[PDB]
Each structure stands twice: as structure tokens, then as C-alpha cells.
């Protein structure tokens, strides 16, 4: 009943509307910092010299942006990977010019999401659950680390991290493709397979379950009132479900153990998103997508183009135009 | 060839700017999310229905009992995220709804791109940009990129047009 | 910015009309209880 012990007992209470916990002790302030600086910046930050060339880019609403084109603009290339907290700037006017808010937001945000993940383990332990939901979340968290931290570390600059804006995102994914041919990288291809695949199985599982609900209601009422929160019996018939899908394809391409089915649901998108997180993280070190440029030639040595060269033409036009004022020398080596 | 199709649509149609594609993206990604989060919830709220360490064996396809605790899952997610599901029928309908809808939405956007009815520009931006050489957004930056794509890709991708672009007309930034 | 003036009345009604529909249905659901 000691002061510290009551405190420790509130932090870890499973009676708080929202669980706090020890990981929450770090997550709440870091995410409140990121959130409050993001909202204020998206609405009012002045323009930022993202690429170090004294060419500021307007990201905020009051400066002529809309919800689609606005962003918090990455910090200046002049800073590269240097740490730029507020107190290192001579004033906030300087810090705003050079993109300081982005660094503040992404660092707080990374920490707080890292702790979101631990928080997920922590409550599972206090509730008597198995622990691995947080491993599922590690794939998005990994993806966020990849585009906000790893890829900058490897390219040398937070100015090549992903902008915090809808159009900024598209900029970053366009330039990524010119510099890395990520479409031709196999880990991105598994990511597509992870994300197309999960959308498919999402709809499968939800269509097959919905197809085999047990009649509990009338046609004047939502079928959902057939289920009561915490009822002990299942609300669909999984054998009717197995019997439909197994005949749609063939018997053994359908599940009838619900534990294996849900683990499969969990594992397919998680694994595919791990890989695509790895792709962004390894392209950070310029181990780029397959290069089949001029791989086909004829008996004389003429180039016979393939679709890979068409892609390259596209990539070329992306390359020669991005950050059009920013290169004095012929190779965009980072 | 599909990859090239993806990049055609960026440079010619500015297809990322299209809300109908964006709702598609949100439905596909929303689906993969729901798939992963639902598989993981079930697998980590399992009841102990067998002695062994592999928990798969303790399911029978004919048991009437639910094999995980919807109640402990609801508490978990209420306290972690603020809301949870409470209705297992809604949950699985929602898993149907989200990705189906998203795909239907992107389809409608493509139908408009059939007619070149693109979501290509924001007029207010082009008006200010034209009058004001200091105004630059991630929107103006991305159209220089599309403009590059068009000019560098078009002669080889559309050979029937005999596009001849001499060096001096190709849009390029400094040095590259 | 030189934004279209009916953007606003379009946005306001797009929000208000379907929102009010749902509010009407919810309130009269709850006074059935």
C-alpha cells in the first residue's frame, strides 16, 4: 500500500478504460508530442527547404495546400543525418525553415509505436492471453521504421525519408522506383502478394463464415442479432463451410481446423509485409531490383527490347526530373 | 508488362491522385490488416482444449463450442485500441465488405480513365503556380515526374506513333 | 487560392444531409426503448 506500490498498481491496472502499463508510460507522452506537432505543422508550418538548395516546399494548409497535397516536409539535406532538436537552432524560425518538425514527429512517433507494440505484449500478459499479437503488429511497425529511419540512414539524409502527406507519399514512391526499380525487386513482389493475398483471404474468410451462419433471426431483422456477445456455441457451421469451399476447389484445398485457418490468415500478410519492409530496408543499401536492361540481343548485337526496357524508359524520365535543381554532377549516387 | 501499366497510369493519368484508387488502396490494405489482426486475435485468445504445446490438435471441426474467447478478445482490443468488435457476425461481414468495396471503387475510377477523365490536376494550384514561381508543393513536384515519364517512355511504348523527340526537347533537370 | 465557390456548399451538404439522416434514425430508435 506504499506510494510506489499503489502507483505501480494503477499503471498495470486492467481496470483502466485504456490500459496504461510501463510501455504506456513512454508511449503516451511520445505520441502526444508527435500528434500535437503534426497537427500544428500540417495546418500552419511555413515552407521547408527539404533538399538543401534553398528551395522551400510548401506543405501546410495556410500556405496554399489542401488535404491531398499538404505534408510535413522532411528536414533539409543540409542536415543529412544530423540530429536537429529545437534547442540546436538559433531560433524557431530557423528550425521551421530547415524542417525540424519532421525530425521531432518521426522520432517521437517511432518510439511511441515501438512501445505500442510492447504495450500489446504487456496487456496480453496481464489478461492471461497468449503473447504473439504484437508479432503481428511488428510488420507495419517494421514498415514504418523502413521508410522513416532505415532508408534515410542508408541514403545519408532524412530528406529522402517519406514525407508525412498524401502527395508526399506518392513522390517518395515514384522516386524510389527510379532509383531502385522496386517493382522488379522480389521482396516488394511478395509484399504485393502479401497484401493482395490478405485482401483475398479477408474476403474469403468473411464470405465463407457469412455464408454458413445458422438461422437464428427472421427476414425483418439483421442476421447479426443471431449472435450474442460471449455465447458459448459457434454461430456458423464450419462443416457446411468446408463442404462448400472444398467442393468449389477440391476437398483438401479447404480447411476444417479453425485454428490452422486463422493462423494461416495471420501468417500470410504478416510474412509478406515483413518482406516488403525488408525490401525497403535493403534497398536502403542500394541492393536494387533486378536489372534486365539490354539483356536480350540478336545475332548481330542489336538490342531487342523487352517490357523491362520499357519500364527503364519510364524509370529514366523519373530519374532525370526528380529534384531537378539539386544535382551538379552526372550521377545521382544517393 | 503489368509493371509498365502501373507506370503508364502514373505519368499519363496521375492515377495516384484519384480518390477512387485511394479508396481501393484503403480497401486492399484494410483487408490485409483485418486478415492479419483477426488471425492473430483468434490464435492468441485460444482456449486450452488440449494438453499439448501445439494448440492446433485441440480443435474438432464438429465441436459446437467457440474455440477462442470473444470476450477476452473484446477486452484486449477495447483497452489497447479503444474499441473492439463485440459481434462475431458483424466482424466476418465486415471482412467481406471492406476489400470487396475497395475493389469496386478502384473499378469505377478505371472506368473514368477509359475516357481520360482523370483526376490529374488541382486548378487552384496550377493558377497560383503559374503566377508565382516560388510556389512549389509535392503536387507540383510529382507532375514534373509524370512529364518526364511521358517524354522518356512514349516513343518506345507507342511505336506506332513514330514519336521522334530530339535530345534538346526532352525534359531534364540539371546534370541528370 | 482560386478555389471553386460551390466547393463549400457541396462539402457542407455532403456532410450534413447523410449525417442528419443517421441521427434521425438513431434518436427514434432509442426512444422506442
Amino acid at each position: 500500500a506504499n506510494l510506489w506500490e499503489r502507483f505501480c498498481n494503477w499503471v498495470t491496472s486492467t481496470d483502466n478504460r485504456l490500459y496504461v502499463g510501463w510501455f504506456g508510460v513512454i508511449m503516451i507522452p511520445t505520441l502526444l508530442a508527435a500528434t500535437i506537432c503534426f497537427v500544428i505543422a500540417f495546418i500552419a508550418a511555413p515552407p521547408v527547404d527539404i533538399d538543401g538548395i534553398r528551395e522551400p516546399v510548401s506543405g501546410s494548409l495556410l500556405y496554399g495546400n489542401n488535404i491531398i497535397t499538404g505534408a510535413v516536409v522532411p528536414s533539409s539535406n543540409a542536415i543529412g543525418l544530423h540530429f536537429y532538436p529545437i534547442w540546436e537552432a538559433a531560433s524557431l524560425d530557423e528550425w521551421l525553415y530547415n524542417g525540424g518538425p519532421y525530425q521531432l514527429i518521426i522520432f517521437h512517433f517511432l518510439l511511441g509505436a515501438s512501445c505500442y507494440m510492447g504495450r500489446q505484449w504487456e496487456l496480453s500478459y496481464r489478461l492471461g492471453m497468449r503473447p504473439w499479437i504484437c508479432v503481428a503488429y511488428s510488420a507495419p511497425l517494421a514498415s514504418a521504421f523502413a521508410v522513416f529511419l532505415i532508408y534515410p540512414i542508408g541514403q545519408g539524409s532524412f530528406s529522402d525519408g517519406m514525407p508525412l502527406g498524401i502527395s508526399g507519399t506518392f513522390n517518395f514512391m515514384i522516386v524510389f522506383q527510379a532509383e531502385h526499380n522496386i517493382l522488379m525487386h522480389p521482396f516488394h513482389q511478395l509484399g504485393v502478394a502479401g497484401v493482395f493475398g490478405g485482401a483475398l483471404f479477408c474476403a474469403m474468410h468473411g464470405s465463407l463464415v457469412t455464408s454458413s451462419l445458422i438461422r437464428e433471426t427472421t427476414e425483418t431483422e439483421s442476421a447479426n442479432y443471431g449472435y450474442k456477445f460471449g455465447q458459448e456455441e459457434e454461430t456458423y457451421n464450419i462443416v457446411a463451410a468446408h463442404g462448400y469451399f472444398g467442393r468449389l476447389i477440391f476437398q483438401y484445398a479447404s480447411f476444417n481446423n479453425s485454428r490452422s485457418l486463422h493462423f494461416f490468415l495471420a501468417a500470410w500478410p504478416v510474412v509478406g509485409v515483413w518482406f516488403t519492409a525488408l525490401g525497403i530496408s535493403t534497398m536502403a543499401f542500394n541492393l536494387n531490383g533486378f536489372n534486365f536492361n539490354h539483356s536480350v540481343i540478336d545475332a548481330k548485337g542489336n538490342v531487342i527490347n523487352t517490357w523491362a526496357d520499357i519500364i527503364n524508359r519510364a524509370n529514366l524520365g523519373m530519374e532525370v526530373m526528380h529534384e531537378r535543381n539539386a544535382h551538379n554532377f552526372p550521377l545521382d549516387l544517393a | 508488362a503489368i509493371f509498365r501499366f502501373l507506370l503508364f497510369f502514373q505519368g499519363f493519368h496521375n492515377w495516384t491522385l484519384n480518390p477512387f484508387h485511394m479508396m481501393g488502396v484503403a480497401g486492399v490494405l484494410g483487408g490485409a490488416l483485418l486478415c492479419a489482426i483477426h488471425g492473430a486475435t483468434v490464435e492468441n485468445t485460444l482456449f486450452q482444449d488440449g494438453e499439448g504445446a501445439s494448440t492446433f490438435r485441440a480443435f474438432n471441426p464438429t465441436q459446437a463450442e467457440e474455440t477462442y474467447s470473444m470476450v477476452t478478445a473484446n477486452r484486449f482490443w477495447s483497452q489497447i485500441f479503444g474499441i473492439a468488435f463485440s459481434n462475431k457476425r458483424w466482424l466476418h461481414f465486415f471482412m467481406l465488405f471492406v476489400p470487396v468495396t475497395g475493389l469496386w471503387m478502384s473499378a469505377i475510377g478505371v472506368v473514368g480513365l477509359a475516357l481520360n477523365l482523370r483526376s490529374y490536376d488541382f486548378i487552384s494550384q496550377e493558377i497560383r503556380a503559374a503566377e508565382d514561381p516560388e510556389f512549389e508543393t509535392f503536387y507540383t513536384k510529382n507532375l514534373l515526374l509524370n512529364e518526364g515519364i511521358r517524354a522518356w517512355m512514349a516513343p518506345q511504348d507507342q511505336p506506332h506513333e513514330n514519336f521522334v523527340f530530339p535530345e534538346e526537347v526532352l525534359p531534364r533537370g540539371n546534370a541528370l | 487560392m482560386e478555389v471553386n465557390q460551390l466547393g463549400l456548399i457541396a462539402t457542407a451538404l455532403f456532410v450534413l444531409v447523410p449525417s442528419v439522416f443517421l441521427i434521425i434514425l438513431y434518436v427514434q430508435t432509442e426512444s422506442q426503448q
Binding site: R17 | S78, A84 | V3, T11, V15
Partner: peptide
């Protein structure tokens, strides 16, 4: 006027978050 509109909708969404968590229909058992 467009800035007021974007920020107003955002603020309404944050308000709905609040009600939907703290003022939800509580889940009850059987």
C-alpha cells in the same frame, strides 16, 4: 474558407473518436 472546412471536418472526426470510446454501447454477456 477551404482551410476552415478541412480543419472543421478533422476536428469533428476527433470528437467522434471520443464518444465512440467513452460513450459506446457497452458489450454485455449472454
Amino acid at each position: 474558407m477551404e482551410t476552415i472546412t478541412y480543419v472543421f471536418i478533422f476536428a469533428c472526426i476527433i470528437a467522434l473518436f471520443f464518444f465512440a470510446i467513452f460513450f459506446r454501447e457497452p458489450p454485455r454477456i449472454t
